[PDB]
Amino acid sequence: GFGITVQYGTDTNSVCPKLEFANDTKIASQLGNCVEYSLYGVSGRGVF
Amino acid sequence: TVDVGPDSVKSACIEVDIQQTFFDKTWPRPIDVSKADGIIYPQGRTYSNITITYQGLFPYQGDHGDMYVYSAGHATGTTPQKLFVANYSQDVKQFANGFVVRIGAAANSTGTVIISPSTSATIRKIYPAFMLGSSVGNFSDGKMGRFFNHTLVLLPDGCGTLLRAFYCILEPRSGNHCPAGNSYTSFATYHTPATDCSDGNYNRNASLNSFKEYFNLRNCTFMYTYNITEDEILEWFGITQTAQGVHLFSSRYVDLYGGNMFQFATLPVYDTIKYYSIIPHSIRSIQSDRKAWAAFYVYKLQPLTFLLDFSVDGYIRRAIDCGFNDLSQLHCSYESFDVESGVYSVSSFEAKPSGSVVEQAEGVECDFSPLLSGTPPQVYNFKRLVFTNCNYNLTKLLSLFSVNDFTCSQISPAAIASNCYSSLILDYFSYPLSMKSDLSVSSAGPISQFNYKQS
Amino acid sequence: FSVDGYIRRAIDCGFNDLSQLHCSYESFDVESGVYSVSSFEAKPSGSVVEQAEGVECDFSPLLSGTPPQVYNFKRLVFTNCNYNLTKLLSLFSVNDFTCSQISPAAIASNCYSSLILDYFSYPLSMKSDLSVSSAGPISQFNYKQSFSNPTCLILATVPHNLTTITKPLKYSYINKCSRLLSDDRTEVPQLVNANQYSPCVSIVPSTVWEDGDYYRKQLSPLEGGGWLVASGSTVAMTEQLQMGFGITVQYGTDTNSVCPKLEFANDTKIASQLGNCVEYSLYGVSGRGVFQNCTAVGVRQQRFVYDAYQNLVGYYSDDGNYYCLRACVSVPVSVIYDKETKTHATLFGSVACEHIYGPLQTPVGCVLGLVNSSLFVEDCKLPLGQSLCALPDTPGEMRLASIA
Amino acid sequence: GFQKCEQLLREYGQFCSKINQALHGANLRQDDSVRNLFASVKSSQSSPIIPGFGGDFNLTLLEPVARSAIEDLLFDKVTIADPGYMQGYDDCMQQGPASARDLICAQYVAGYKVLPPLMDVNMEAAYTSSLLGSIAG
Amino acid sequence: GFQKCEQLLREYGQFCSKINQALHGANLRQDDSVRNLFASVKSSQSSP
Amino acid sequence: AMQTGFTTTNEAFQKVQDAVNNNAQALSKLASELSNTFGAISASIGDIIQRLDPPEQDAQIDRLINGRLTTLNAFVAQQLVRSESAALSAQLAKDKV
Amino acid sequence: IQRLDPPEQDAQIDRLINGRLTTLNAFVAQQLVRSESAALSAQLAKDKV
């Protein structure tokens, strides 16, 4: 048996599937724009 | 499977001349929701003399849609020659939620013979032909428009007297000008009025037979026909797809003069239609008898809320697209076409994302190695691996075992393998499968009471 | 309850309107006044039923040839027919029959817009992989039931003498289905949607040859480019074929014409009960009301006419007539009570006495318990409305007095 | 009327008793408000209204026709649904609803009732008519 | 802006129409209150 | 000049119509809210009972109850607000007479 | 939405809806109470002027 328990917000949500990153998903390259974001599991929409 | 008649025995297809310039016309007929264009009537019920909002699949107010026009082929006097078409077979569109079609809007107007711009003729209604399916790609020479596996074909025939719907595999023929042969451009259907549209006996297979020159029909699961009484009346056609199959809508069997669409058929097509195209059609008229054929317009559907005005007789004659503009939102909020003068607040104009930003921990894999080495503990001595600041992959672990039962609670299956977590805690132990149920939350047996319990 | 706990006095709160009043205040003594109480309910005097009656829904396809694998499930859609699940269930040894968002009794007895039956070969050893909570390969890549419509899942074994159903060589399934994007770095799992087929169905053969077979298709630009890939897996075949049957039912996209068959009495017709309050069940639509013969409105083909509050207000019957449907209407009740005399009268506001000394018709409704007095008051304690007043006889009956 | 629902409704306490008592009090409040208001409009002494009341001052607009002419016009120009105080129950069955969203016929369907006012029209007219005749004096 | 939520919100009836109409009326009430109040403070004749 | 004054430009006249409209709105809440499901599978109790067994049937009926109890509480709260307002207004009418 | 499937996702969204509908009803009820009060007060101001 394998039990899996997951927690969602005691720390940065740093346990993630691996992701290949594009350089158009950086924050610095999209300042002033409305973007969707996912930052270490934290998500929503906004302007950086 | 269904017998759909014999294969074509011709060694070659009729040559098709594609000259899109001639079909690049501007004859706009956008959806006018105030005139109830493009509306499919609420399906399980009717209403009388009321104005209500309704949620359903509707075209957008102001949508121009995609115009398609069929033409006469090439001729020399009394001997028709080459077919003349637009680049339609290669223009494959995403199906999404389906579409509605405005058919014969220009009928009775003086129009143009597309093949001969200086020649005018009275415009006649012509029915659209469609090819729909799950997967698309190219033909032998690299041109697009090939559909794979079963393809739904809606092919009007009998010079506009029947709609033939079939779901079959289309096997490109290899003859001259055919899709698997030499000198291929585009497949097209055709009929030859001179022999196919006699005043009495119309050839009910004229378009089917031309279709068959380009493709062999294989593993057909059905072929249905619907009758059409001839007229020059503007009509609407629509197609949608649900778990029950493909639904064909039309205004002509219920609201002929009004235009509201009602379902007339459901087809047993269960794979998802993702793509569609217009099958170009060319009429092999003699040079001296070319007609102008009405353009048809295809508009896409989406789940919109409309304000629908139901007359005493139940037809929808007027409507508001509640998301078109702010004025429309106002009418919908009061469920009326007439609201009092004033200044009103309406939904804000939303800012929409222009992109996305992502940051994730990227680095070390989370290490499930301990798990794989030595004798696992008993259930009361389970061992715990706590993963933080790492990249996880459950497949990497799951793929090493023959999984008998994998279930999740308070998280979806898709989510367990794709979300980010503060931590992932893995508790592993030896456990007989015969005691599977003793690990259930509802269990009152020894495992859940004294050995191991999940959060 | 007395101090010693015994019950010495009680009110039956449903006996009459006066009793309802005492109960609503939880007291045996309430103040004088005119009070609204529960209406006098109209009750059904019978019932009307209309159902599609005709062709049986045909489960024959199901019984002939080799059933498909779970990712190639076949679908039978039943509309406008009489269903009988026992007829199908009785042909198989059912191992597990469960329902979700519909009761067991209901699955076999309600009318539906449609019934969709999805059948396939399926090992019983993988039973749990069809659970909603499952994160295994069947629920992720092969077959998933609707979360929106009520569903049932039947797992059953084909009997040795049901010789019309043949067996595949092995059971098989997709254990992987994903897309490789044009960059060939990112792989995206392609999960199956409820009631749909996996995108990998076109690359996976009807039977997986052997466990571990890998399939790939090059996608065109219109499909987003990249590759669609999948892996198959197998389960050894059992002595008797095990099959799954998913059932999905919809309740209101059309006339609910998929019904159990019903033997009809001719006393359940609408025409024979016009003007009465009846229970009705019309092609799965039900409630209580009064049918009336009236002028047709709405679209005939749509059968059921609704108002602006979504009530059913009319119906086109299979007998050719259009009926208006009115709610069974309750009869308003107000109790006129005088505490000092311990007397009362009942006002049925807005009601003509034809529906109820005998009853007295007044400007505010029909009143029982009052006697018309042609007397005037200024000092009215029990106003009835308009310029009417109940005046106790003091005990006798209350008088109906006019306010001067 | 569904018993299962009623059984579950009971677990919310005497909900309906509260609804009924709150409205009963609210309704008594208007009968008391009306009674008090009219008691105060009421004249002790008043002159009769006769045609010609007003002399050179044209008051025919206000003279009872009984409501006055302006009073009838005021009512005729306001769109008011007829509550059917005497026999609305029946009007809604033999004729049915007047239009979409007919809130008077909805009463017998939805479970609510519109109650009649404390004074009838002729009594209210009598109060303002006697008031008119009292103004000069 | 979430479509799933909006889909569920619809099952609560025309909730938002009620919110908007109630506030619209409440807001008109102040414009009418203000207009009436100032109409009465307004002088016919006044010295500079 | 006033005989023809009961029109769109007469503020007092619209207030009369608005008092009437407010009564209608109060009743429309009860007439229109019974069609809501409040997350339930149906606005009809009879449909819930016919389709579901008690452990789920209960939850669905309960959604309808909560929605209807809420509606009635809102209705009553407004009848109390409106009757309080009308009573104050009645005293103003008393003073004006 | 990101964490749950429809049968549970629905229940969770619905909790948020109920809470927000409640909040808006409370807000509106108070704007109506406050606007009624301000209107009465405005008539007092009228009388004082």
Ligand SMILES: *[C@@H]1O[C@H](CO)[C@@H](O[C@@H]2O[C@H](CO)[C@@H](O[C@@H]3O[C@H](CO[C@H]4O[C@H](CO)[C@@H](O)[C@H](O)[C@@H]4O[C@H]4O[C@H](CO)[C@@H](O)[C@H](O)[C@@H]4O)[C@@H](O)[C@H](O[C@H]4O[C@H](CO)[C@@H](O)[C@H](O)[C@@H]4O[C@H]4O[C@H](CO)[C@@H](O)[C@H](O)[C@@H]4O)[C@@H]3O)[C@H](O)[C@H]2NC(C)=O)[C@H](O)[C@H]1NC(C)=O
């Ligand atoms: C999470 O964790 C899971 C599990 O660890 C990861 O999933 C794995 O992902 C890898 C890819 O990164 C994937 O490998 C692929 O396997 C297929 C299958 O081939 C096998 O069968 C064929 C049959 O013809 C054999 O020829 C082949 O050698 C393999 O045989 C295996 O089994 C036999 C025993 O039966 C052994 O003897 C063998 O040694 C072997 O183990 C391969 O076809 C695929 O190859 C393609 O990619 C590689 C990349 O290195 C490339 O070099 C190849 O040329 C080829 O690429 C070309 O084709 C692709 C289209 O398919 C195209 O896109 C390219 O551009 C090229 O044209 C590769 O090796 C493995 O199977 C997955 N396992 C599971 C269980 O899912 C998952 O990725 C992890 N997630 C994250 C985010 O990291």
Ligand SMILES: *[C@@H]1O[C@H](CO)[C@@H](O[C@@H]2O[C@H](CO)[C@@H](O[C@@H]3O[C@H](CO[C@H]4O[C@H](CO)[C@@H](O)[C@H](O)[C@@H]4O[C@H]4O[C@H](CO)[C@@H](O)[C@H](O)[C@@H]4O)[C@@H](O)[C@H](O[C@H]4O[C@H](CO)[C@@H](O)[C@H](O)[C@@H]4O[C@H]4O[C@H](CO)[C@@H](O)[C@H](O)[C@@H]4O)[C@@H]3O)[C@H](O)[C@H]2NC(C)=O)[C@H](O)[C@H]1NC(C)=O
């Ligand atoms: C939904 O779908 C389901 C499944 O299709 C339907 O349910 C079926 O309904 C039919 C009736 O319509 C029902 O048939 C009845 O079967 C019994 C059982 O008898 C068997 O055993 C006895 C043992 O003594 C045998 O003698 C008899 O021949 C039967 O044997 C069967 O099996 C053997 C092998 O073991 C075979 O060799 C046989 O050929 C046979 O298959 C019968 O007793 C019953 O008979 C009564 O009704 C018939 C009507 O035609 C009548 O002719 C008989 O004389 C007798 O009627 C008298 O008695 C009844 C009281 O019982 C009384 O009311 C009458 O007035 C008479 O006095 C009949 O044949 C079948 O078993 C059901 N199957 C299942 C799985 O449930 C269901 O109805 C469908 N729903 C809807 C709405 O349509």
Ligand SMILES: *[C@@H]1O[C@H](CO)[C@@H](O[C@@H]2O[C@H](CO)[C@@H](O[C@@H]3O[C@H](CO[C@H]4O[C@H](CO)[C@@H](O)[C@H](O)[C@@H]4O)[C@@H](O)[C@H](O[C@H]4O[C@H](CO)[C@@H](O)[C@H](O)[C@@H]4O)[C@@H]3O)[C@H](O)[C@H]2NC(C)=O)[C@H](O)[C@H]1NC(C)=O
């Ligand atoms: C190209 O040209 C053709 C004709 O040359 C047009 O076809 C005509 O279109 C009009 C409008 O759609 C049709 O008029 C409708 O006829 C209906 C029935 O007509 C039949 O029955 C009546 C008796 O009930 C007969 O008198 C009549 O001759 C027919 O036998 C009417 O019921 C319709 O009225 C309904 O709609 C109107 C509003 O449009 C309402 O005011 C009415 O109250 C009622 O609801 C209407 O009169 C006409 O009949 C069609 N001709 C033919 C031959 O059928 C094409 O539309 C035109 N094409 C384009 C694209 O413009």
Ligand SMILES: *[C@@H]1O[C@H](CO)[C@@H](O[C@@H]2O[C@H](CO)[C@@H](O[C@@H]3O[C@H](CO)[C@@H](O)[C@H](O[C@H]4O[C@H](CO)[C@@H](O)[C@H](O)[C@@H]4O)[C@@H]3O)[C@H](O)[C@H]2NC(C)=O)[C@H](O)[C@H]1NC(C)=O
């Ligand atoms: C024009 O298009 C129509 C499509 O609408 C197409 O109709 C098809 O015609 C064929 C016959 O030509 C039908 O097939 C027959 O159906 C009957 C049904 O009972 C069968 O009994 C026949 O079986 C006999 O003939 C077979 C011939 O091979 C033998 O193999 C068999 O053993 C029997 O002897 C046969 O299946 C077919 O069902 C219809 N299809 C539809 C969808 O209606 C028509 O043929 C086209 N015409 C031309 C000239 O192309």
Ligand SMILES: *[C@@H]1O[C@H](CO)[C@@H](O[C@@H]2O[C@H](CO)[C@@H](O[C@@H]3O[C@H](CO)[C@@H](O)[C@H](O[C@H]4O[C@H](CO)[C@@H](O)[C@H](O)[C@@H]4O)[C@@H]3O)[C@H](O)[C@H]2NC(C)=O)[C@H](O)[C@H]1NC(C)=O
């Ligand atoms: C849905 O439609 C797709 C597309 O039509 C279909 O995929 C096709 O499957 C067939 C066989 O099932 C493939 O045809 C041949 O299959 C044999 C198998 O032994 C191969 O050996 C053949 O190879 C030749 O072509 C190769 C091209 O590179 C050569 O390298 C090789 O030497 C041979 O000359 C050939 O593949 C057919 O190619 C695919 N088509 C595509 C576009 O992939 C699919 O099966 C259908 N799905 C279902 C579920 O019915």
Ligand SMILES: CC(=O)N[C@@H]1[C@@H](O)[C@H](O[C@@H]2O[C@H](CO[C@]3(C(=O)O)C[C@H](O)[C@@H](NC(C)=O)[C@H]([C@H](O)[C@H](O)CO)O3)[C@H](O)[C@H](O)[C@H]2O)[C@@H](CO)O[C@H]1O
């Ligand atoms: C394009 C052009 O001008 N070609 C010259 C011919 O016009 C000319 O022969 C005359 O052709 C006349 C018809 O010309 C068109 C037409 O409008 O009908 C020109 C169109 O552009 C062409 N359409 C398309 C899509 O290619 C159309 C078509 O070819 C024919 O209909 C064939 O079926 O022809 C008309 O028939 C005159 O009677 C005829 O003399 C020839 C000289 O004979 O020279 C060409 O360069």
Ligand SMILES: *[C@@H]1O[C@H](CO)[C@@H](O[C@@H]2O[C@H](CO)[C@@H](O[C@@H]3O[C@H](CO)[C@@H](O)[C@H](O)[C@@H]3O)[C@H](O)[C@H]2NC(C)=O)[C@H](O)[C@H]1NC(C)=O
């Ligand atoms: C006192 O005032 C009233 C009105 O407030 C005067 O009575 C009005 O007299 C006019 C005559 O110009 C009537 O006009 C008529 O209207 C009808 C409407 O259909 C029309 O058909 C006639 O041709 C004419 O235009 C008006 O209706 C009438 N109004 C009433 C309420 O009677 C009255 O005469 C004044 N008295 C004195 C002494 O001046």
Ligand SMILES: Nc1nc(=O)c2nc(CNc3ccc(C(=O)N[C@@H](CCC(=O)O)C(=O)O)cc3)cnc2[nH]1
């Ligand atoms: N073969 C053939 N088929 C046709 O359908 C056809 N149609 C026309 C005419 N088509 C049209 C269509 C729309 C307008 C039109 O009046 N459009 C408006 C704009 C409408 C809007 O955008 O709201 C305009 O003022 O141009 C004119 C001609 C001419 N020849 C034809 N020839």
Ligand SMILES: *[C@@H]1O[C@H](CO)[C@@H](O[C@@H]2O[C@H](CO)[C@@H](O)[C@H](O)[C@H]2NC(C)=O)[C@H](O)[C@H]1NC(C)=O
């Ligand atoms: C369809 O509805 C309209 C309402 O929009 C009805 O017209 C009303 O009819 C009544 C009859 O007494 C009049 O008092 C109203 O003033 C009319 N209103 C309008 C806006 O005209 C119309 O009669 C209905 N048609 C049918 C057949 O019922």
Ligand SMILES: *[C@@H]1O[C@H](CO)[C@@H](O[C@@H]2O[C@H](CO)[C@@H](O)[C@H](O)[C@H]2NC(C)=O)[C@H](O)[C@H]1NC(C)=O
């Ligand atoms: C389409 O139908 C045919 C016949 O019904 C299927 O069976 C193949 O038919 C060809 C005819 O030349 C034979 O050569 C093959 O050997 C047959 N295969 C089998 C397995 O019997 C064919 O499989 C069907 N295709 C699809 C996609 O369903």
Ligand SMILES: *[C@@H]1O[C@H](CO)[C@@H](O[C@@H]2O[C@H](CO)[C@@H](O)[C@H](O)[C@H]2NC(C)=O)[C@H](O)[C@H]1NC(C)=O
């Ligand atoms: C669709 O139209 C066709 C053609 O009118 C109908 O087929 C005809 O049916 C009659 C019935 O007596 C036969 O006499 C003709 O010989 C048939 N014609 C042909 C070409 O076969 C067909 O039945 C109609 N379909 C429907 C559903 O009504």
Ligand SMILES: *[C@@H]1O[C@H](CO)[C@@H](O)[C@H](O)[C@H]1NC(C)=O
């Ligand atoms: C951004 O991505 C492109 C993709 O090819 C890469 O060539 C480029 O060097 C990247 N830029 C940086 C700063 O890494």
Ligand SMILES: *[C@@H]1O[C@H](CO)[C@@H](O)[C@H](O)[C@H]1NC(C)=O
């Ligand atoms: C077909 O022609 C249209 C219209 O000129 C153009 O927009 C479209 O891209 C063309 N498509 C192809 C596949 O050539």
Ligand SMILES: *[C@@H]1O[C@H](CO)[C@@H](O)[C@H](O)[C@H]1NC(C)=O
């Ligand atoms: C699509 O085109 C490529 C080259 O253009 C050819 O290799 C490939 O086989 C074509 N696909 C089909 C299905 O013929």
Ligand SMILES: *[C@@H]1O[C@H](CO)[C@@H](O)[C@H](O)[C@H]1NC(C)=O
């Ligand atoms: C199949 O039919 C035969 C006929 O004699 C019977 O003996 C046998 O027991 C039947 N088997 C089953 C599984 O019912």
Ligand SMILES: *[C@@H]1O[C@H](CO)[C@@H](O)[C@H](O)[C@H]1NC(C)=O
């Ligand atoms: C009504 O049912 C009875 C039952 O026996 C039957 O005799 C009578 O003929 C039926 N009437 C009609 C009109 O079918």
